[PDB]
Design brief:
Belongs to the integrin alpha chain family. It is found in: Cell membrane; Membrane raft. The chain is an all-alpha fold and 24 residues long. Helix content is 46%, strand content 0%. The termini are far apart.
Length: 24
């Protein structure tokens, strides 16, 4: 099910500095 993380994680990591202090 890890395929779900890389889905929302990869998007945030590329976001360019997503809020929440969670640097994907």
């Amino acid at each position: 099910k890890l395929g779900f993380f890389k889905r929302q994680y990869k998007d945030m990591m590329s976001e360019g500095g997503p809020p929440g202090a969670e640097p994907q």
